[PDB]
Design a protein around this ligand. Structure first.
Ligand SMILES: CN1CCC(n2nc(-c3ccc(Oc4ccccc4)cc3)c3c(N)ncnc32)CC1
Ligand SMILES: CN1CCC(n2nc(-c3ccc(Oc4ccccc4)cc3)c3c(N)ncnc32)CC1
Lengths: 195, 192
């Protein structure tokens, strides 16, 4: 019943652009919206991947590996899933294992890959694949995890036990001036609610 | 070693503006970033995690099918809205639920501010966990009274079957599932 009428460019940046989206509401009455799009069209279906990295060791609890980055848009540090944009002609799976090794230094294995899911639907058309990845911590490969962080990327690795995640996050928020990614907190909330 | 230096406005909209953020990296080398901010409260809005509890049934997660102009399509998300001036996130969550879904809920817990799009925006929300006694009379005929210009379809999915039930909806229609909803569902399988 609803659909897009027009998409008028307001301002194009280097990385991202702002557009006035005119659309038809269900009452046959037009409205507008301020929408964000990346300046460079994605060849790949979806824009990026968020990696859910599970650090599995014998004689240890299963840990979820997160990244503490300084995030200019936020003006602070955020705790997020290792994430990055998909290189042109590269499977989401390939991308997830690349972005993990780069951000954390961990060499993992695929578990499963989400369809494209919207990151910020009320602002952006950003879609990602949530890729579930296993890490064999007992393996030698993951003894000395050597990150290949790529240029201008300054990542601190934070592995937290799956069993205690939500409470362990609440502790880090209160203990530092930090912010948790909504998807990391959504994930952690489900782990408590599941048990 | 890292901090924001300056913020040059690129373009201001009615609702949202784009700014060139100059910042210091840890090596004492300055970089730039394109950041989005509201043109105009601790956090910005709430996402409601509404658990429909009925006896002799599986717990359902109540979701909303909204048209999202930025996406050019319909998205399946948690009931969400902006926090009204001088209003608790809890108040907001129970208001936005009743408005979008017609359900009267009870608070379970409220997340701290969590960044919605840290690589783009300074948008934070409170993820509010809410229980719904479907057996109760108040929730017998759930009549959504949605705000003007808000056109929400309610979709209840069984909690037990969520991830598989989502994958089915994506493949079966031209729809998109919100990353936060999919994150929740993924954790339900991964848990224990
Ligand atoms: C009542 N009425 C309803 C529409 C409401 N509304 N909000 C936005 C909007 C979208 C995303 C957004 O993201 C943030 C949030 C915080 C920080 C940085 C980015 C902020 C606002 C919008 C728009 N883009 N176009 C038209 N209407 C818009 C206004 C209030
Ligand atoms: C190597 N490579 C170079 C570009 C780097 N980069 N990416 C972005 C960026 C951020 C958010 C974004 O959101 C989307 C995505 C899809 C659809 C709609 C919105 C898009 C791009 C960025 C920026 N805004 N400012 C400065 N550098 C930026 C990253 C690392």
């Amino acid at each position: 019943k609803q659909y897009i009428i027009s998409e008028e460019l307001i301002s194009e940046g280097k990385w991202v652009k702002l557009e006035k989206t005119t659309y038809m509401d269900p009452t046959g009455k037009t409205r507008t919206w301020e929408s964000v799009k990346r300046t460079t069209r994605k060849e790949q279906t979806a824009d990026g991947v968020a990696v859910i990295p599970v650090l599995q060791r014998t004689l240890h609890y299963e840990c979820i590996v997160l990244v503490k980055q300084f995030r200019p848009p936020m003006g602070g540090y955020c705790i997020e899933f290792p994430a990055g944009l998909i290189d042109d002609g590269e499977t989401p799976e390939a991308a997830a294992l690349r972005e993990l090794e780069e951000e954390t230094g961990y060499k993992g294995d695929i578990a499963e890959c989400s369809p494209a899911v919207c990151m910020d639907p009320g602002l952006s058309n950003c879609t990602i694949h949530i890729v579930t990845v296993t890490i064999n911590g007992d393996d030698a490969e993951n003894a000395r995890p050597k990150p290949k962080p790529g240029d201008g990327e300054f990542v601190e690795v934070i592995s937290l036990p799956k069993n205690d995640l939500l409470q362990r996050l609440d502790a880090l928020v209160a203990e530092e001036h930090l912010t948790v990614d909504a998807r990391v907190y959504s994930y952690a909330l489900a782990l408590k609610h599941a048990n």
